[PDB]
Amino acid sequence: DIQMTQSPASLSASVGETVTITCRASGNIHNYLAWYQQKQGKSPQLLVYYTTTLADGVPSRFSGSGSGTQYSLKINSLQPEDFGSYYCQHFWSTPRTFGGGTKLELKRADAAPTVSIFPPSSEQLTSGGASVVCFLNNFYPKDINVKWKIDGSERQNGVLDSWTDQDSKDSTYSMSSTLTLTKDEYERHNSYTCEATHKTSTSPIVKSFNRNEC
Amino acid sequence: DIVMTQSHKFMSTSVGDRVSITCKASQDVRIAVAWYQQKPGQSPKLLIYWASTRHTGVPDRFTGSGSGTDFTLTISNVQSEDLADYFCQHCGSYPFTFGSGTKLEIKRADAAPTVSIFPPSSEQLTSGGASVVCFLNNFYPKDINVKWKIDGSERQNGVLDSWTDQDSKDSTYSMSSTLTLTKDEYERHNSYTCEATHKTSTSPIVKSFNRNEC
């Protein structure tokens, strides 16, 4: 089997930059190499084939080269659309092999989250559930901190966070935070708080709500 | 190395027939095979690639087939103008190897040669040589035999035979036989005969001259 080694595993680059992704084969693959771009849980898309040939409608800024066992893909003048993973694959013998992938993120100016705290809806209350949901949308960079404060007391349980891939348009990230309690545990308190700790500030972006108001 | 073998050097077909040139690869080469046409005194042209993908402008008389070790190029309704040489190419790995080539010979009715013997020119003799020429033109099939008898002596020495490629205009063959002697060799004789043997006659076609008849 010919093993493919892709490097680096990740890249961060600004619009206009040049990115070099490498792929090494453990045996000569005689120019039988393809490159794919993959956006968040969508089917991989063929970019380049037979080492150097661009697939129809792939822009000229993509450029593959190599021979033997050494191959490369360069993105000259990156565009926001270029985020995602890239994979190389040899087509020389069977088994075919994919390199491990490269996750490319576009850098952009820092931007602070816009937060929204949501009280549990009647429907859940009835079920005996109490999920407090907080959205921190459109922030860059990806690192953000969220403290959950129930009556000033910070919680470190029953909280679920989930991030978004980078946004195709403004290259931004978004996140959700869900604190789930049992209806009674919930009714047993009054100030519910979501406190965002993000690089763009020295003072937490706090959002709170009170159990008996609208 | 992969050896691409075209076992037949010639292929006889009639204008209007179907012809099929096979190419066999020394090992499984899946579909990495191409087919080129070389009309006499011109550069090869691409007909088929990836074993059966016809190229732009190749008339559909041409079709490619095969996966593995056995490839076939099939010309349907063989035109006269398909009279050319056909090579198979392997693309699986470097270096690319080619098949021996298969020349396509157009079938015609038999034709006996029109022979002509020519004495060494006055001008040539002045400068000491003696080339006696003999044209055996416009016959078919190409299997013809020639021998020079100088006063009963079959001289097969200093003889150059030069064969024409099948003509497009009438699918015949023509040839020249030259007996290059030095003026002294020539002067020491009178009977010069061009004896050609071809399936059209049981009789050797004999064209002769006698040094002194002038």
Next chain:
Amino acid sequence: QVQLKESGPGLVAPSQSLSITCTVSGFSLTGYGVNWVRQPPGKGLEWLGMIWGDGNTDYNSALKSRLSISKDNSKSQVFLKMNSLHTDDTARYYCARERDYRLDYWGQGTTLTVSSASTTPPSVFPLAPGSAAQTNSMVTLGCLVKGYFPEPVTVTWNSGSLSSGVHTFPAVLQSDLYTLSSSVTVPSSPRPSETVTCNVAHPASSTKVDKKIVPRDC
């Protein structure tokens, strides 16, 4: 026009067998090969095997013993059968058309979750603001899709007519149950005056929930 569509069971218990069909359209399986590729969650692409135009098949060295590939040219089907599954076989499965040493058309893929856990429909709740909120130029609404299994779920706004400012967040797995949420941001001119609905579909359950984001009138 060229289309590859895969179909499989979504959930299988470990130690069982899996059968996935790839139905192709717009091309004939005698001129192209179909490859099978799998993607474990958060991992890279892994080649499973292939079937060439001429019916010859090739398999991944490590799965050679559990895998079988075959097709039906007449029916436009390629089939993958994997025996003795493990949880590690959980991945999104794809079939892709190989046109002369390049995979040019890929299927959408089919998620396969290898587990003993069971199908549970999602519980959909609207995420509405509070009186405080209509003072800004835009409002963010949401949908909680709690306790469902297995993945995936499709969340849509106004039957797909609301695509701008929609953020759907990937599912998180708590205890054999998934929780997902999506937010949509709309101009305060529209909600509440105009209706905003969150359509949530869970295929594995024949669940098709629609929720109207109504103002918390309290």
Next chain:
Amino acid sequence: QVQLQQPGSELVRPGASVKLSCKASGYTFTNYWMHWVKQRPGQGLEWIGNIYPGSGDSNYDEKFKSKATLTVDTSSSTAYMQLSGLTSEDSAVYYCARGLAFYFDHWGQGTTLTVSSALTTPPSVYPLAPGCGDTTGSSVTLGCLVKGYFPEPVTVTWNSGSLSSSVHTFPALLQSGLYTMSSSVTVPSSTWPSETVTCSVAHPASSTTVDKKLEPS
């Protein structure tokens, strides 16, 4: 549109080098591999190597590793192959072809390279009229013996170009390190000798142009 311009012939001496060229036109030179293929006199095809203009990656048949060197001139869209230490068995048609990495879809014309110690010599053309011992029918065959010339080629045209009336040119053959070739035109006896028949032989290599009007007896 896609044009691959290669010079017609090259004459070099044993042990020397030559840098064959191929000027490309009608396509983005840097997006297609450039291949080099040899063809020995009435034989098979041999792939030497390929080069990707855009990056300079190249693949060679090891047989030619020390002999062929592929190079490119981005600025003029010209591909070059330099052959070193030519021996006689390096004489042939060298074609350039562009394509994808694996097959070639456009070929150049070819450069026929002669590797010889031979001296550029002009040809001696002798007319061949039916000799004494006559028996003229309705047709007559005339010829021109073209000999002792080097290097190849010669262009034999029959009478004012007009005479293509069954002309037959035979391939040239090396005899004693010099070429010899013949051409024959068959015409109606109602025209020669009553009208002139001249074969005109041209030898570019030495600028020589000869005219031979055919006379009876």
